[PDB]
Write a protein that binds this ligand. Structure first.
Ligand SMILES: [Zn+2]
Length: 543
């Protein structure tokens, strides 16, 4: 943890104790003694929780908290503590690349070129531009999660979140090396593009390939069956382009419009290419105002559904990001005509099924947005942030999750909520927003009822058997990956059995197991890691 921020140790049990000691491990000296807070029952975990507050101790070092007979694992106080996990999480995207060979000396991850057949992936249906079965080059991009499919909604939202991390602290990222393996992104590296932007461009390049001539965007690339726990270069079965959706077309437009702004200082032609693509997508959407989600039978036989049959929050993001990037006030008129509700409220954490906050963030940073409506959107952000602070401040684990929030992707949700707190802090600075955001990083790294980090490679306990075909087939730790997190609703055979057989029933915050097949809680995905990168950006030391 950081010298200038709050410092609590959360203790489950230990009801009979009254005091704690913070001990410097190098000297054995007690640097701080205090009284424990009162024990309070935590609904989501079933734990009775108290905490040791030593925030006023600011000296860097390695320490342990003693309570009664027990002493915590060593932990650090230091300004530099979040730089390493930020770097690991960001470079994990490089290690997820598809269509290239990877030989990474940092982790030892090695694989041959994978999914070369994506250069001729077959369209699963007939459309005005391709006969069914016709090949399209949709190579490149990132493998989505523990599988090797590539999906526009999560690709666009993850890329956007990473670009917002760039925009939060460009000077941090200009001097941050991701130790890109040999052979990767050679033209971009020769041009001196910052490593984070090199990596994001690999995904944007792929997203561009998913757009068809009329501006609409296909849904995903995958096979007709799920591969086993095999290296990606062994997944030789035919690959297809599946689906067509307006919500994904709009997310593509948002990501491309954001990329146009982000890349313009570096690559004027590429930035223009992104902006023109974003506008073709927006024009498709304006001419096709009703939502579409195409479903052909079999398209989910080897890949996830990522189904949304409405699209308002994503159309709003597309228009608002275009407003921000282009300064064309016609987008403000369009937004005020169709999306006035999102200018007055409805803030919610970013995820692939709801990008309202990406749109609100774009709007409040748009020079040509109406000033009174920008004020309204700032108030929507602060109302949501204030709610998160209220929840976390009264929660024994300082968590922004409620008992009913332990659904698939809860760890993403915790970090998406932290992201929202940081965006609120940007428009209306408030130390409570910063501190509560940082509390979700403490939670993510293991200060939680499950007793484990949900980011690989970090924490006394962390996921060692993530549902991840590359990790499993190569037996190589890839640090920095965020797994779904505790999920009391089930969805895989391991969790389904645990939840149905347990008596007493499992408490939602503990509905997690570290097993290869527990994909409803233990699978990492690009859109889980992305908000973690964003949040850690704020707290990482520059140099
Ligand atoms: Zn691949």
């Amino acid at each position: 943890m950081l010298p200038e921020f709050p410092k609590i140790a959360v203790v489950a049990g230990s009801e009979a104790e009254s005091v704690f000691r913070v001990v410097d491990i190098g000297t054995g000296d007690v640097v701080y003694e205090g009284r424990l807070s009162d024990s309070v029952y935590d609904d989501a975990s079933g734990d009775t929780v108290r905490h040791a507050d030593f925030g006023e101790w600011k000296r860097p070092g390695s320490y342990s908290v003693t309570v009664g007979r027990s002493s915590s694992a060593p932990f650090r106080i230091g300004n530099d503590v979040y730089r390493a996990p930020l770097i690991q999480a960001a470079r994990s995207y490089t290690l997820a690349r598809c269509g290239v060979a990877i030989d990474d000396p940092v982790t030892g991850l090695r694989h041959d070129v994978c999914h070369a057949q994506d250069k001729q992936a077959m369209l699963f249906f007939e459309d005005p531009f391709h006969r069914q079965g016709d090949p399209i080059d949709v190579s490149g991009g990132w493998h989505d999660a523990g599988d090797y499919g590539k999906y526009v909604p999560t690709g666009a939202v993850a890329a956007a979140q990473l670009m917002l991390a760039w925009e939060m602290r460009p000077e941090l990222w200009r001097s941050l090396s991701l130790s890109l393996p040999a052979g990767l992104s050679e033209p971009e590296r020769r041009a001196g593009l910052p490593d984070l932007l090199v990596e994001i461009k690999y995904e944007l390049d792929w997203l561009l390939r998913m757009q068809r001539p009329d501006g609409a965007v296909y849904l995903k690339v995958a096979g007709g069956a799920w591969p086993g726990y095999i290296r990606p270069e062994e997944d030789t079965a035919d690959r297809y382009v599946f689906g067509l959706s307006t919500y994904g077309t709009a997310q593509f437009a948002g990501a491309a419009a954001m990329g146009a702004r982000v890349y313009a200082p570096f690559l004027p032609d590429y930035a223009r290419k992104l902006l023109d693509a974003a506008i073709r997508a927006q024009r498709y959407l304006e001419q096709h105002p009703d939502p579409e989600f195409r479903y052909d039978e079999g398209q989910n036989n080897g890949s996830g559904p990522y189904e949304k049959r409405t699209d308002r929050e994503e159309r709003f993001w597309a228009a608002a990001e275009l407003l921000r990037t282009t300064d064309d006030a016609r987008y403000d008129a369009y937004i005020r005509e169709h999306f006035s509700d999102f200018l007055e409220g409805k803030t919610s954490a970013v995820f692939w099924g709801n990008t309202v906050l990406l749109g609100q963030w774009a709007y409040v940073n748009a020079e040509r947005a109406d000033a009174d409506h920008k004020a309204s959107v700032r108030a929507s952000l602060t109302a949501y942030a204030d709610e998160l602070v209220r929840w976390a401040s009264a929660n024994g684990y300082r968590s922004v999750l409620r008992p009913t929030d332990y659904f698939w992707g809860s760890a993403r949700e915790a970090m998406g909520r932290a992201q929202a707190l940081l965006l609120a802090d940007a428009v209306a600075p408030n130390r409570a927003y910063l501190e509560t955001a940082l509390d979700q990083a403490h939670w993510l790294f293991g200060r939680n009822a499950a007793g484990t980090s949900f980011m690989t490679g970090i924490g006394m306990h962390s996921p060692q058997k993530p549902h991840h075909r590359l990790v499993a087939s190569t037996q190589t730790l890839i640090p920095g990956l965020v797994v779904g997190g505790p999920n009391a609703q089930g969805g895989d055979p391991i969790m389904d059995r645990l939840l149905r057989e347990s008596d007493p029933r499992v408490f939602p915050a503990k509905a997690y197991v570290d097993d290869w097949e527990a994909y409803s809680v233990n699978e990492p995905a690009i859109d889980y890691t992305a908000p973690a990168v964003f949040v850690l950006t704020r707290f990482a030391e520059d140099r």
